[PDB]
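User: Assemble these into one structure.

Assistant: Restating your components, then the assembled model:
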Amino acid sequence: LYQDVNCTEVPVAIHADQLTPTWRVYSTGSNVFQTRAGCLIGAEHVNNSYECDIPIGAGICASYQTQTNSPGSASSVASQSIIAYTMSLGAENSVAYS
Amino acid sequence: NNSIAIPTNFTISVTTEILPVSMTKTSVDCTMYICGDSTECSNLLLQYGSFCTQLNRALTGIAVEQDKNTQEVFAQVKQIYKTPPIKDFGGFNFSQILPDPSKPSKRSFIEDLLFNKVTLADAGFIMQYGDCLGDMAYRDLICAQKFNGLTVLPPLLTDEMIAQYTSALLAGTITSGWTFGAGAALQIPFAMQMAYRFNGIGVTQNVLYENQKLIANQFNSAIGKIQDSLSSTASALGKLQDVVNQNAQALNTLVKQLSSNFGAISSVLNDILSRLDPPEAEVQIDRLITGRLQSLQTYVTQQLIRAAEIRASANLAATKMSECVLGQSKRVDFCGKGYHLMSFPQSAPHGVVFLHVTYVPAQEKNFTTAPAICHDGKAHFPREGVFVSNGTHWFVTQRNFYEPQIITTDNTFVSGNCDVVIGIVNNTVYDPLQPELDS
Amino acid sequence: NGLTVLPPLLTDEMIAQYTSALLAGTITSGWTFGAGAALQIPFAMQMAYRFNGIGVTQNVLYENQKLIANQFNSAIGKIQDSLSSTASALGKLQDVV
Amino acid sequence: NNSIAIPTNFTISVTTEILPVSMTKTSVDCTMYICGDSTECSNLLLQYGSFCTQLNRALTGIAVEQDKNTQEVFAQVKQIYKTPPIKDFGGFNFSQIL
Amino acid sequence: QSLQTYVTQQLIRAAEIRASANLAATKMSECVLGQSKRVDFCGKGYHLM
């Protein structure tokens, strides 16, 4: 994680300026996207939110396995890898008040 | 010896307490601060060694404890609670302090007024104008102010999360009362929550209902007074503003100290190298590095004192939240002046705010009291409440409010004789059994 | 060398006045003045409520009221002995100074 | 399982607790302490600059907080109360401490 | 350096004094003004005043 900086000045000659509003970011889904707090390499953003594992900042936490405290089987050599996500603020609940 | 004062009316006063929780997270790098891309200066600086490594460790520990303090103060319940879509509380209106669903940002009205009460600028368009600053609007982000690598690490917890925690706690208090803090949340009407709280302070809940609606108004008006407290007093947020000002002054002073000569020929390493030869300039460079290291050590020590102050404030804030907000505290003057009824938390930039709703007598009247009553040789002591007299008749009223009632054997028991008590008086006690035997 | 000692904002007379006022309120107004407007009440009736606070029925108080007063009075005398038999009571202030 | 202890008599013990509130308010001036009416020493000392200004600010803050602590400890009631001219308390005698 | 050391010691003493004064004020609010149910906070034994 390059902190409080933008991964733009780093040497890159493989891409040509295409006149893009945001750092030529054309993704089909939740693929790695630049963050204002810092530039992270090695994790993919996920829309879903879970309990914080490794706090970083601005509510962004990183976790290795793509699940939280599973009583069952852990991670494997499969496509699952490190992810960075907005920690789930508590647990949603509803109270029947009258 | 024979005069007592009994309250005949009560008022619901509300106060505010601002408690710092955290502060700006700072970090200083030895290399850039002391040496500007010069190999010789770096080589000389590495001689000291572990000083910079321990200063960085101390700063990291300060940041970790500052984050933990905020987590403890706010993140206390794993379950997030929300208010019902229909706002019915028997007369109470928390919409002023509750988040506004219409506004895209879930910020309470109180926070909006706190932000507005500071001197802002009209030259342009007010789109965002400060998302983290402690109630001001300034120029460009830390990168603008970072000309020596004085990086400011963003806080782990965002203001939106703090506001969500405060809203959840407030909703639990309104709906679940204090049950959620002691275990699983238990829904209960708000009008029935104040009934138990009055009994907690020795006031029978019977008054509440008789003035329930009125009490609600007394509560509502109190909220309005809070707004006046902002107009008539700008020192409510004095603690947070003073802390921010002190931190900014310390950072600025540390920045200007870079230009201090410390008895050298010049305050710039490049000028010294250009005008003066390296080998003889070694002494001047060493002296400058020593001075900068001493200044950094002094700044770090001051930061340690500030961190100790902030943690001490945050521990008290968390204790109050656990006691004042989640439950009911019997400690006097701990949850605000007067008998404690409840407390509402509110987010604040690098701090927290507590609004203490309390019970305070309003009108008091004098009465003639006696230690006890002994009619037929057997004394009669009050189980609850103190005897009062208007000059002709003797009545029994509850401890913290005027509510005279006919004296009966149900509310008193027999202990001792007439002689044993000192100052005792004689009176007749209504016996429910006697009229029944007449028929 | 100019080691000026700034005088304290609060004078000992003011501290003594505050202590006397608080003590008088406690004797006369009990704990009511700290929670709002002062409410006069006989001292003998103040201990009655305090005993009930600790789970002791006030009935005992009256039966031994005078005696209790003596037990209180004698205690004050013991304080004087604490000064003669122990000079470390003010250890904190002396050590700080 | 069938034995209990019940008090048959009570005593009124009194203890004392001494708590520091404040201390002596001190102040040190850089000029006189370091330099005795010498221009060169003062000129050299002014090179450091903000050190003396921040030390004085810290001392002033210490004094302010020490005064505030005393104010909070003692100045808690705006209304000053006084004992009645007749000392009748049902047997208690506070004249020793009053 | 000596002045800085003295000022640091003064800061520690001030922190000690404020910590003592906060406890004293809490006791005054609880022990003196009201009745405290906390054990061994307002002296050994059940607190009366």
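The first strand of chain A starts at residue 2 and ends at 3.
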